[PDB]
Amino acid sequence: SGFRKMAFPSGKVEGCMVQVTCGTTTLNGLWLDDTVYCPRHVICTAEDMLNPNYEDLLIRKSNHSFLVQAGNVQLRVIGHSMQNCLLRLKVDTSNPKTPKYKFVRIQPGQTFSVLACYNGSPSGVYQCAMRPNHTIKGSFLNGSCGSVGFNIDYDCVSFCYMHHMELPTGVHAGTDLEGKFYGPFVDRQTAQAAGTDTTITLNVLAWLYAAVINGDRWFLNRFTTTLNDFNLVAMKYNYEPLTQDHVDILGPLSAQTGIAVLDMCAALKELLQNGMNGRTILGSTILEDEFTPFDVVRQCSGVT
Amino acid sequence: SGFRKMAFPSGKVEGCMVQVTCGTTTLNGLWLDDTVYCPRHVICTAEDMLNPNYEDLLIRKSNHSFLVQAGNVQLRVIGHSMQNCLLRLKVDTSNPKTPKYKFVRIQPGQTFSVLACYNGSPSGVYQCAMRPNHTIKGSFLNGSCGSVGFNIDYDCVSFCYMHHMELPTGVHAGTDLEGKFYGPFVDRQTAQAAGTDTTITLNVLAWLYAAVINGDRWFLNRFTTTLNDFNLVAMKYNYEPLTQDHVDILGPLSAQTGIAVLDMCAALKELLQNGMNGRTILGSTILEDEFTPFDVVRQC
Numbered sequence: 001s002g003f004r005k006m007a008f009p010s011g012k013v014e015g016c017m018v019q020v021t022c023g024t025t026t027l028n029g030l031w032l033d034d035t036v037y038c039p040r041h042v043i044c045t046a047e048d049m050l051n052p053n054y055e056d057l058l059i060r061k062s063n064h065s066f067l068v069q070a071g072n073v074q075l076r077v078i079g080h081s082m083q084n085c086l087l088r089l090k091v092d093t094s095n096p097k098t099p100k101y102k103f104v105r106i107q108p109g110q111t112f113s114v115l116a117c118y119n120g121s122p123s124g125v126y127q128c129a130m131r132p133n134h135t136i137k138g139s140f141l142n143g144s145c146g147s148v149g150f151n152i153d154y155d156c157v158s159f160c161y162m163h164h165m166e167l168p169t170g171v172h173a174g175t176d177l178e179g180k181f182y183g184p185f186v187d188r189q190t191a192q193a194a195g196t197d198t199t200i201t202l203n204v205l206a207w208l209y210a211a212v213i214n215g216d217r218w219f220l221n222r223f224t225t226t227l228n229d230f231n232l233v234a235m236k237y238n239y240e241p242l243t244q245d246h247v248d249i250l251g252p253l254s255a256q257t258g259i260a261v262l263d264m265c266a267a268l269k270e271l272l273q274n275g276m277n278g279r280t281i282l283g284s285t286i287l288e289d290e291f292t293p294f295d296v297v298r299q300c301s302g303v304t
Numbered sequence: 305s306g307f308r309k310m311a312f313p314s315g316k317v318e319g320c321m322v323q324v325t326c327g328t329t330t331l332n333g334l335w336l337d338d339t340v341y342c343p344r345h346v347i348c349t350a351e352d353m354l355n356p357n358y359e360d361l362l363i364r365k366s367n368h369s370f371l372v373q374a375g376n377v378q379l380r381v382i383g384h385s386m387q388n389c390l391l392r393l394k395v396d397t398s399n400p401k402t403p404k405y406k407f408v409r410i411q412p413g414q415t416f417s418v419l420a421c422y423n424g425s426p427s428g429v430y431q432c433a434m435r436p437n438h439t440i441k442g443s444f445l446n447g448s449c450g451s452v453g454f455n456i457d458y459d460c461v462s463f464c465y466m467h468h469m470e471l472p473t474g475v476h477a478g479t480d481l482e483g484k485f486y487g488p489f490v491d492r493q494t495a496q497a498a499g500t501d502t503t504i505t506l507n508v509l510a511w512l513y514a515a516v517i518n519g520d521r522w523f524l525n526r527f528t529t530t531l532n533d534f535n536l537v538a539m540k541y542n543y544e545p546l547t548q549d550h551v552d553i554l555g556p557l558s559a560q561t562g563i564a565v566l567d568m569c570a571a572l573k574e575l576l577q578n579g580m581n582g583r584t585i586l587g588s589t590i591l592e593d594e595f596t597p598f599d600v601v602r603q604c
């Protein structure tokens with residue numbers, strides 16, 4: 001009993017964080033080997049952000065326009081270029097703390113840790129999920145842009161996110177580490193169409209499984225359902241449709257707990273219709289959707 | 305908008321985590337300068353967790369009886385002693401990654417980050433609070449004992465917690481870095497349980513002030529109250545009664561948001577007596593109590 005959102009330890013990412021400055025704008029950069037990656041809107045002033053022409057703004061810049069600082073040490077920029085919505089700044093020093101890493105583009109519903117930074121200074125870490133509408137529900141203030149999300153896999157840090165914007169509903173939009181936006185968003189300050197978020201059904205089921213592994217079973221029932229009959233109900237409540245490929249992903253948890261996926265679907269179906277009537281599941285009311293099947297497996301078996 | 309529990313970056317503390325083994329037991333320890341601190345129950349054995357006699361066990365042990373590993377490096381233990389419920393192992397090497405640090409005793413309602421480890425290896429970081437009943441609602445598995453809790457103030461790690469026990473309700477008991485338990489708990493596998501817990505009103509109000517900073521403002525009402533009146537209510541909802549010193553602490557946020565503490569209390573009193581009616585605060589159904597007034601200021 002007892003289960004909560006955990007982030008990955010952030011030591012390896014913190015040794016990569018730098019401050020990038022252009023004009024009077026400062027934000028955060030990622031220093032790996034001899035490149036710093038950062039949002040290309042570092043080259044925007046006030047007047048630029050409504051409708052920036054980035055190739056225009058960039059041709060007006062030199063290596064020397066960028067001041068990069070790591071700790072108290074200035075790094076010299078000896079090359080710059082733009083990749084989608086990112087700048088790649090080549091520096092004179094290759095980072096001694098660079099970890100094994102890779103860049104990956106993640107999918108809706110997957111989770112990752114975010115190291116939130118201000119002026120290249122790591123300030124907090126938390127865990128969140130890529131929402132079905134390609135936003136993230138983070139916690140960020142002015143100066144956070146350039147913060148990164150990642151996962152750790154054995155020894156290797158997979159970077160999957162770099163923060164760029166806060167939408168007016170309070171959620172956040174950013175890019176992968178090739179600078180491609182998650183979602184239909186652009187790095188201009190103009191109203192943009194977002195899209196109703198939905199509940200990550202696959203994660204809610206993972207989390208019900210986690211409850212069963214930790215001893216909470218009160219919500220189980222001896223019904224079952226069809227995938228299709230489940231989706232009829234779920235879709236009414238703004239849950240994502242459950243695909244057979246989602247069912248296959250839950251196979252391992254099902255095997256381990258002895259509760260068939262469709263039988264767990266039957267449990268969620270009743271939860272959605274009736275609620276919890278006062279009870280909790282892992283200390284929550286509310287069905288939690290930001291733990292993946294892998295999160296649940298990692299955290300119920302404590303992989304380091 | 306957008307507001308979340310976050311932990312301090314764990315890097316400074318990852319540098320201090322080591323694996324201590326004695327007999328068949330392996331747990332976590334914290335390596336600062338030339339000392340490793342770990343729970344003394346590391347010297348117990350299957351047979352005698354019910355009534356350990358620690359003073360006996362510790363003479364039976366030589367330095368040899370402890371193996372300490374930092375990554376792939378055995379650390380030679382060269383002194384062992386006990387401070388309350390901790391062991392202090394003197395090692396032959398000073399930890400080169402030792403940070404600036406202090407040991408502090410945290411108080412109920414205060415928050416800290418936890419770095420969860422297995423076999424001296426970092427597994428994850430999450431944020432919690434010392435409950436009023438001296439437990440923490442943590443997330444721990446077998447092998448986690450010795451995992452530590454901390455705050456980071458500027459560049460100084462303040463270590464506040466080290467993990468020892470899981471109680472039958474799934475809550476955790478532990479000690480400060482001098483080995484003194486929080487609560488009336490002991491390091492013996494013996495019937496003992498968390499008293500009833502309360503809600504940390506002080507934090508809930510902090511959180512409401514955050515809400516009405518970040519934009520959420522619907523729960524504010526034309527109503528007023530008295531501490532005395534409010535408290536009588538709080539106590540019927542299993543809330544910690546508010547004190548004057550508590551109100552003095554909310555002054556900043558009260559100064560910043562322009563909402564009198566007692567005014568905010570009257571909003572709380574109402575939410576208690578009437579529910580949230582489906583709507584939310586900061587995207588939460590339910591009122592949150594693991595954000596201190598200091599946390600709010602930091603994350604705003």
Ligand SMILES: *[C@@H](C(=O)N(CCC(N)=O)NC(=O)[C@H](Cc1ccccc1)NC(=O)[C@H](CC(C)C)NC(=O)OCc1ccccc1)[C@H](O)C(=O)OCC
Nearest residue numbers: 041049140141142143144145165166185187188189190192
């Ligand atoms: C960078 C910074 O810290 N942040 C994070 C702010 C936060 N709390 O997360 N980023 C910004 O404020 C964006 C700056 C920008 C980027 C590209 C082009 C021009 C400006 N701006 C926004 O996030 C902006 C903030 C609102 C005005 C409050 N959001 C939107 O415009 O919403 C648009 C939208 C996008 C997608 C879907 C729907 C709508 C720091 O501010 C900085 O250094 O700026 C450099 C210019």
Ligand SMILES: *[C@@H](C(=O)N(CCC(N)=O)NC(=O)[C@H](Cc1ccccc1)NC(=O)[C@H](CC(C)C)NC(=O)OCc1ccccc1)[C@H](O)C(=O)OCC
Nearest residue numbers: 345353444445446447448449469470491492493494495496
């Ligand atoms: C170390 C370890 O991981 N943990 C914590 C595990 C967790 N999920 O939090 N430490 C322990 O398990 C405690 C070990 C111990 C402490 C003192 C003396 C001897 C052994 N024991 C407990 O936490 C124990 C629960 C266990 C899961 C059985 N809790 C209680 O003792 O609660 C009191 C009680 C009430 C009612 C009935 C019985 C007991 C790892 O376990 C280790 O290294 O152990 C070394 C001895």
